[PDB]
């Protein structure tokens, strides 16, 4: 009864944590891709200026 | 008593989930804007090189 409700709340917390961790991993990848693209642009803009 | 405490915990979980979903939506918009800006820069840098 209460133990069922306790478990419902706990399973929700595990879902929240797993979805959050999944999103952070994707955001980390996106930040590395952004940095990579910006460095490539910086390099070529400066090469063409020179 | 315990049912009040169960509901306090459940309302917290609904708040966590709603705030998280809101943040993800804003981050998705930001990633599309970043990609859009990078593609525009790639296009013009390459046009001016040519």
């Amino acid at each position: 009864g209460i133990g069922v409700t306790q478990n419902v709340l706990y399973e929700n917390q595990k879902l929240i944590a797993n979805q959050f961790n999944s999103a952070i991993g994707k955001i980390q990848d996106s930040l590395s891709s952004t940095a990579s693209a910006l460095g490539k642009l910086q390099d070529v803009v400066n090469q063409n200026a020179q | 008593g315990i049912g009040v405490t169960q509901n306090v915990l459940y309302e917290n979980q609904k708040l966590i989930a709603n705030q998280f979903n809101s943040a993800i939506g804003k981050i998705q918009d930001s990633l599309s804007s970043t990609a859009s800006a990078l593609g525009k820069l790639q296009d013009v840098v390459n046009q001016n090189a040519q």
């Binding site: 979805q19 | 979903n21 998705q28 990609a35």
Partner: peptide, 27 residues
Amino acid sequence: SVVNIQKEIDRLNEVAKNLNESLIDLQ
């Protein structure tokens, strides 16, 4: 010189979409 950042752009658009799978389902 030309720049090639299409793989990065593709990845950003891919994540912008597949973050839908990380959303918490209220129901």
